[PDB]
C-alpha cells in the first residue's frame, strides 16, 4: 500500500468510541469483547508477546517505543517479587481526549487488555492510574470492573484459565507530570509525582520496587483485539514500522472538532478535511498545526500540505507523533500567544524536582510573555533557543524536552512574526 | 600670557625660540574640569547567544 486512510468500520477497533451503544458488560459482549480470552491466556505469555511483536505496535503514550519489546522486558522468571502492570490513564497532555473517551465508553476493552497484558508479562495485578479530574470515567471503570468480577472474568480464575489477576483503579490529584512513567509510579507509591531516574528501569525496579510496566490505555485496549485478530492484520494496517490504527483528537480552529479512529500514515490534510470538516475558513485560512499534542512542535501550512501522521513522517517533518492530538490554528490565531500559553502550562505543571526544567521553564515562560508583549530585542530569540537547547536532554524526564520543543518550533518557523512584533513595539515606544 | 610685548621680544631674542606660541603654563586650552557623563562600550563577550565560555 502507498496511500493510507479510509479506514473501514469493520476494521476499527474502538467500535463504541461515540457511546452510541451500551458500555456495560452486555454491550461489550455484543460488540465482541471477552471472546476466546481464556484461549489466549492458555496459549500463554510467549505467544502473546510474539503476536504483539509481529503486530509491530508502538506505544500510544507518546514516545512510541515498540510495545512487543517493552512488554517482553518482563519475560523473566520471578525473583520472589510480584510483578505489576500499570495503565497510564492520566492523559494530562493538552489536545488529547482519546483515553477519556475509551475509558468512559469502552471500559471492558481496557479491563480485557489489562488481563491480556498481565498474563503476557506475568503479573498478579494491573493498577490503572486514572486522572483525578475524571471522576465519572473512574466510576464507569469501577462499574465495568465490578461487572467483570461478578462474571468471573477477573479474580482468582481469569476466565477459567487458572490464572489469578486483580485490576485496581487509583485516582490522581491533578498533576500533568503524574502522567509520566516514573512519576506515575511514585504517585501510586504515595509520594509526590516526581520522576525517578533510569536505571533502574521499571521492568526491574518499578511500583513498590517490583518489576512493572506502565502502558497507555490505547495500547492496552488494542492489545486483546490484536491478539484475537492476529498481528499480521494490525501490521498490514499502516506503513512499515508505523502500523495499525490510531485515535486522533482534532481540536482548535476546525469546523467539527472531534475524536476519530483512523488508519495510520493518513495525510493530515485528508484527515482534517474528511473527519474535522476542514479548517474554519479553509485550508488557505490554515496557518499552523501542532500534530501530536503540546509536547511536539508546530508545523506551518506549507509542510502541512503533504505531511503524514507517522512517527517517522513527523520526525522527518522535525516533529513527533505523540498522543495524536491535532491542534489547528488559522490566520486569526495569535501564534506567539498560543505557544506562550503552552509554555505557561509547562511552567505550572513542571514538578520542580530538577534544576534545568524548573528554572529554565520558568525562564522560558517569562521570556515568552515578554515576546508576546514584544518587550525584547531580537538577540533574545537566539538566547531563548540556546536556553531551550540547554533544557532539552539534560532533564530527569522528558517534560523538559516537551517544553523546549514548542519554543524551538516557533523560533524555527514563525521567526519573522516575532521580529515584526518586536520592531513594532520598539517603534511605538520610540 | 600676560607678558608685555617688550618682555616677550626680550624673551624670544634671549632664548632664540618663539615662546608665546608654546607656553608651558596652561591658561584656557585645557579641558573643562566638569565633563559630560560618558557611556563606555561593552566588550565582544556581551552577547546573548553563541557565547559559551568553553569556546573562549
Ligand atoms: C624699570 C622696570 C620696573 C618694573 C616694571 O615696571 O615692570 C612692569 C613691566 C613688567 O613686564 P611684564 O613681565 O610683562 O609684566 C608682568 C605682567 O604683564 C603684569 O603684571 P601683573 O599684571 O601681574 O601686575 C603688575 C603690577 C603689580 O603690582 C604690584 O606689585 C604692586 C605692589 C604694591 C606694594 C605696596 O604692577 C607692576 O608691577 C608695576 C611696576 C612696579 C615696579 C615697582 C618697582 C619698585 C619696587 C619697590 C622698591 C622699593 O615692565 C615692562 O613691561 C617694561 C620693563 C622695562 C621698563 C623700562
Ligand atoms: C511529562 C510527561 C507526561 C506524560 N503524560 C502521559 C499521559 O498522561 N498518558 C500517557 O499515556 N503517557 C504519558 N506520558 C508518556 C509516558 O512516558 C508513556 O505513556 C509511558 O511510558 C507508557 O508508554 P507507552 O506509550 O508504550 O504506553 C507522559 C510523558 C511525559 C514526559
Ligand atoms: S524535567 Fe521537570 S517535570 Fe521532569 S523531573 Fe525535572 S523538574 Fe520534574
Swiss-Prot record, chain A:
<feature type="modified residue" description="Omega-N-methylarginine">
    <location>
        <position position="229"/>
    </location>
</feature>
<comment type="similarity">
    <text>Belongs to the complex I 51 kDa subunit family.</text>
</comment>
<keyword id="KW-1278">Translocase</keyword>
<keyword id="KW-0004">4Fe-4S</keyword>
<dbReference type="GO" id="GO:0051539">
    <property type="term" value="F:4 iron, 4 sulfur cluster binding"/>
</dbReference>
<keyword id="KW-0813">Transport</keyword>
<feature type="modified residue" description="N6-acetyllysine">
    <location>
        <position position="76"/>
    </location>
</feature>
<feature type="modified residue" description="N6-succinyllysine; alternate">
    <location>
        <position position="53"/>
    </location>
</feature>
<keyword id="KW-0560">Oxidoreductase</keyword>
<keyword id="KW-0679">Respiratory chain</keyword>
<feature type="binding site">
    <location>
        <begin position="59"/>
        <end position="68"/>
    </location>
    <ligand>
        <name>NADH</name>
    </ligand>
</feature>
<keyword id="KW-0472">Membrane</keyword>
<feature type="binding site">
    <location>
        <begin position="171"/>
        <end position="219"/>
    </location>
    <ligand>
        <name>FMN</name>
    </ligand>
</feature>
<keyword id="KW-0520">NAD</keyword>
<dbReference type="InterPro" id="IPR019575">
    <property type="entry name" value="Nuop51_4Fe4S-bd"/>
</dbReference>
<keyword id="KW-0411">Iron-sulfur</keyword>
<keyword id="KW-0249">Electron transport</keyword>
<dbReference type="GO" id="GO:0051287">
    <property type="term" value="F:NAD binding"/>
</dbReference>
<feature type="binding site">
    <location>
        <position position="357"/>
    </location>
    <ligand>
        <name>[4Fe-4S] cluster</name>
    </ligand>
</feature>
<dbReference type="GO" id="GO:0005739">
    <property type="term" value="C:mitochondrion"/>
</dbReference>
<keyword id="KW-0285">Flavoprotein</keyword>
<feature type="modified residue" description="N6-acetyllysine">
    <location>
        <position position="347"/>
    </location>
</feature>
Curated annotation (Swiss-Prot), chain B:
<feature type="modified residue" description="N-acetylalanine">
    <location>
        <position position="1"/>
    </location>
</feature>
<feature type="modified residue" description="N6-acetyllysine">
    <location>
        <position position="39"/>
    </location>
</feature>
<comment type="function">
    <text>Accessory subunit of the mitochondrial membrane respiratory chain NADH dehydrogenase (Complex I), that is believed not to be involved in catalysis. Complex I functions in the transfer of electrons from NADH to the respiratory chain. The immediate electron acceptor for the enzyme is believed to be ubiquinone.</text>
</comment>
<comment type="subunit">
    <text>Complex I is composed of 45 different subunits.</text>
</comment>
<comment type="similarity">
    <text>Belongs to the complex I NDUFA7 subunit family.</text>
</comment>
<protein>
    <recommendedName>
        <fullName>NADH dehydrogenase [ubiquinone] 1 alpha subcomplex subunit 7</fullName>
    </recommendedName>
</protein>
Amino acid at each position: 500500500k502507498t496511500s493510507f486512510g479510509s479506514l473501514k468500520d469493520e476494521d476499527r477497533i474502538f467500535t463504541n468510541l461515540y457511546g452510541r451503544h451500551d458500555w456495560r458488560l452486555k454491550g461489550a459482549l455484543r460488540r465482541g469483547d471477552w471472546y476466546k480470552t481464556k484461549e489466549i491466556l492458555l496459549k500463554g505469555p510467549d505467544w502473546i508477546l510474539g503476536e504483539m511483536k509481529t503486530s509491530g505496535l508502538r506505544g500510544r503514550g507518546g514516545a512510541g517505543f515498540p510495545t512487543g519489546l517493552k512488554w517482553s522486558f518482563m519475560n523473566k522468571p520471578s525473583d520472589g517479587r510480584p510483578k505489576y502492570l500499570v495503565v497510564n490513564a492520566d492523559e494530562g497532555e493538552p489536545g488529547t481526549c482519546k483515553d477519556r473517551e475509551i475509558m468512559r465508553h469502552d471500559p471492558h476493552k481496557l479491563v480485557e487488555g489489562c488481563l491480556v497484558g498481565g498474563r503476557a508479562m506475568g503479573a498478579r495485578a494491573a493498577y490503572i492510574y486514572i486522572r483525578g479530574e475524571f471522576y465519572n470515567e473512574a466510576s464507569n471503570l469501577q462499574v465495568a470492573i465490578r461487572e467483570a468480577y461478578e462474571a468471573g472474568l477477573i479474580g482468582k480464575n481469569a476466565c477459567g484459565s487458572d490464572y489469578d489477576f486483580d485490576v485496581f483503579v487509583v485516582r490522581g490529584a491533578g498533576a500533568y507530570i503524574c502522567g509520566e512513567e516514573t512519576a506515575l509510579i511514585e504517585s501510586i507509591e504515595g509520594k509526590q509525582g516526581k520522576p525517578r531516574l533510569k536505571p533502574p528501569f521499571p521492568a526491574d525496579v518499578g511500583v513498590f520496587g517490583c518489576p512493572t510496566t506502565v502502558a497507555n490505555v490505547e495500547t492496552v485496549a488494542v492489545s486483546p483485539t490484536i491478539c484475537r485478530r492476529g498481528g499480521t492484520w494490525f501490521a498490514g494496517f499502516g506503513r512499515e514500522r508505523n502500523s495499525g490504527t490510531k485515535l486522533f483528537n482534532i481540536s482548535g480552529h476546525v469546523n467539527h472538532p472531534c475524536t476519530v479512529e483512523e488508519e495510520m500514515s493518513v495525510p493530515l490534510k485528508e484527515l482534517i478535511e474528511k473527519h474535522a470538516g476542514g479548517v474554519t475558513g479553509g485550508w488557505d485560512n490554515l496557518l499552523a498545526v501542532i500534530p501530536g499534542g503540546s509536547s511536539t512542535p508546530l508545523i506551518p501550512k506549507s509542510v502541512c500540505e503533504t505531511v503524514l501522521m507517522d512517527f517517522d513522517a513527523l520526525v522527518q517533518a522535525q516533529t513527533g507523533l505523540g498522543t495524536a492530538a491535532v491542534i489547528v490554528m488559522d490566520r486569526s490565531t495569535d501564534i506567539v500567544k498560543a505557544i506562550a500559553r503552552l509554555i505557561e502550562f509547562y511552567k505550572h505543571e513542571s514538578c520542580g524536582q530538577c534544576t534545568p526544567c524548573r528554572e529554565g521553564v520558568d525562564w522560558m515562560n517569562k521570556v515568552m510573555a515578554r515576546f508576546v508583549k514584544g518587550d525584547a530585542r531580537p538577540a533574545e530569540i537566539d538566547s531563548l533557543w540556546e536556553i531551550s537547547k540547554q533544557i532539552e536532554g539534560h532533564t530527569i524526564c522528558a517534560l523538559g524536552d516537551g517544553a523546549a520543543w514548542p519554543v524551538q518550533g516557533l523560533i524555527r518557523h514563525f521567526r519573522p512574526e516575532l521580529e515584526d512584533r518586536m520592531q513594532r513595539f520598539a517603534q511605538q515606544h520610540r | 600670557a600676560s607678558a608685555t610685548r617688550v618682555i616677550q621680544k626680550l624673551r624670544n631674542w634671549a632664548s632664540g625660540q618663539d615662546l608665546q606660541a608654546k607656553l608651558q603654563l596652561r591658561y584656557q586650552e585645557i579641558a573643562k574640569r566638569t565633563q559630560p557623563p560618558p557611556k563606555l562600550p561593552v566588550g565582544p563577550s556581551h552577547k546573548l547567544s553563541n557565547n559559551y565560555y568553553c569556546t573562549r
